[PDB]
């Protein structure tokens, strides 16, 4: 009966699954960690039209408090959730864009220094994109990811 506001700005009826799928993911390969815990801890308070971004941010801070001596893994769990959330505001999707397109767009926005284009060539950027390993964002911890995010 209730609705939610997706990132793009589309709206669809609330679906618990969307949250279950996500949490179940970052919990993959972890132990002593329970999905149900985060959901209830979150005491997430649905209310007609709620932005999907807020819902994601609430669950992250939840699994963040879980981190404890008994169940440390949680601090990889939250970290994984944070990066997923960051990839949304940064590229609108999990799969990152080409190293060269990313620098170009930014330069036009005034984010990166324009010298990057005067020192390196397009043919080189594509050569550096190979060294990159976005799969290394999971090697981070909530404490680390939180810092980068801020």
């Amino acid at each position: 009966n209730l609705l939610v506001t997706k990132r793009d700005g589309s709206t669809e009826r609330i679906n618990l699954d969307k949250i279950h799928r996500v949490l179940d993911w970052a919990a993959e390969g972890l132990h002593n960690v329970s999905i149900s815990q985060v959901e209830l801890r979150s005491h997430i308070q649905f209310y007609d039209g709620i932005k999907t971004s807020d819902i994601h941010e609430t669950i992250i801070k939840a699994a963040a408090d879980l981190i404890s001596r008994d169940a440390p893994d949680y601090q990889y769990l939250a970290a994984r959730l944070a990066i997923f959330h960051l990839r949304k505001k940064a590229y609108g999707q999990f799969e990152p864009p080409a190293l060269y397109d990313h620098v170009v767009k930014m330069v036009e926005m005034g984010k990166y220094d324009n010298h990057l284009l005067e020192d390196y060539t397009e043919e080189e950027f594509k050569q550096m994109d190979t060294f990159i390993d976005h799969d290394r964002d999971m090697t981070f911890s909530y404490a680390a990811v939180k810092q980068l995010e801020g």
Partner: protein
């Protein structure tokens, strides 16, 4: 062959737990198995009144619960009411006729009593949540998913009561009633008693705990405050129930009380294993029906079924059976939350010995 009083002056301390001699005198100054005596004193201290519980705000919280959610709650509540209604009478009826010791006799009656109180609490919770309680009660009998479990509970108790009657009317031996031949062997009668306890255990150890998860599930959501309190109290009393059953099984499987029973226990081990797996499985199926409309925040078909296995292993390993499900970390740790100037001193000589 049963008597509410046995004339013979038998020694209560030597007499076995079951199939012995009908308890004549009720003394508690000495017990063969202090384990039971402790359960009595411990159970009596947990005496609660379902009334004291304010269950008033639950009427509005239930109306707010989403149509799929009402299902989860009411359905889980119906099943619980079913069990404790059976385990309200079953105990005394199938246990008293066999018991031959006081410490255990009183236990069973006190154990069956606490169950009636539980059956009373549910009735107090329903009337507060719904308008017409009859709508719920009349269902527990007609419902499809509810009946099988009730039928399963019925099979083992009755099967034990039937023979117990023949063991008193007929004794060991083959007898004919209207052309028919009845074989009454104490060896067989012991299997039913053992197998029965195995079911009572799984029911009060796994079956019931599988429902508490859903009951306390709403609690974590600050929903149904009243009903969670009541359910919480039942859990405490429930623990004592599953505990007593376990010890009885061990004492029989260890040949402590009766040398023959350990043998018998070894023969049914395989059948007893399939029993737990039978119930443990039925628990999963219900989770699917309990969620067929949808899911809650931090509980669902998948996450729930996981708990079923986790607890089954602990309960089975307790009585002495191989772990049917794979070893796992607990899937809902939250269920445990409901289950219990400056010193100024200066010395020159002390520091003068320190070389820079």
């Amino acid at each position: 062959a049963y008597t509410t009083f046995s004339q013979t002056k038998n020694d209560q301390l030597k007499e076995p737990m079951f199939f012995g001699q009908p308890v004549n005198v009720a003394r508690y100054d000495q017990q063969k198995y202090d384990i039971f005596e402790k359960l009595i004193e411990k159970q009596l201290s947990f005496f609660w009144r379902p009334e004291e519980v304010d269950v008033s705000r639950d009427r509005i919280d239930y109306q707010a619960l989403p149509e799929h959610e009402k299902h989860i709650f009411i359905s889980n509540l119906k099943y619980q009411t079913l069990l404790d209604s059976i385990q309200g009478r079953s105990p005394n009826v199938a246990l008293l006729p066999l018991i031959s010791i006081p410490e255990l006799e009183t236990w069973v009656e006190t154990w069956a009593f606490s169950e009636t109180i539980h059956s009373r609490s549910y009735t107090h919770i329903i009337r507060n949540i719904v308008n017409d309680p009859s709508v719920v009660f009349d269902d527990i009998v007609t419902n499809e998913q509810i009946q099988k479990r009730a039928e399963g509970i019925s099979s083992y108790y009755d099967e034990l009561i039937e023979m117990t009657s023949y063991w008193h009317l007929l004794g060991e031996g083959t007898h004919t009633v209207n052309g028919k031949t009845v074989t009454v062997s104490l060896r067989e009668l012991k299997k039913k008693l053992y197998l029965c306890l195995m079911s009572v255990n799984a029911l009060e150890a796994i079956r019931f705990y599988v429902s508490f998860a859903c009951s306390f599930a709403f609690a974590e959501r600050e929903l149904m405050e009243g009903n969670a309190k009541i359910i919480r109290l039942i859990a405490r009393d429930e623990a004592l129930h599953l505990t007593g059953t376990q010890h009885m099984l061990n004492l029989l499987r260890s040949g402590a009380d009766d040398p023959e029973m350990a043998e018998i226990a070894e023969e049914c081990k395989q059948e007893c294993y399939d029993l737990f797996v039978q119930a443990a499985q039925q628990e999963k199926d219900w989770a699917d029906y309990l969620f067929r409309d949808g899911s809650m925040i931090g509980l669902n078909k998948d996450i729930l079924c996981q708990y079923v296995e986790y607890i089954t292993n602990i309960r089975m390993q307790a009585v002495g059976l191989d772990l049917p499900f794979q070893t796992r970390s607990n899937p809902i740790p939250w269920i445990n939350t409901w289950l219990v100037q400056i010193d100024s001193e200066v010395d020159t000589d002390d520091l003068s010995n320190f070389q820079l």
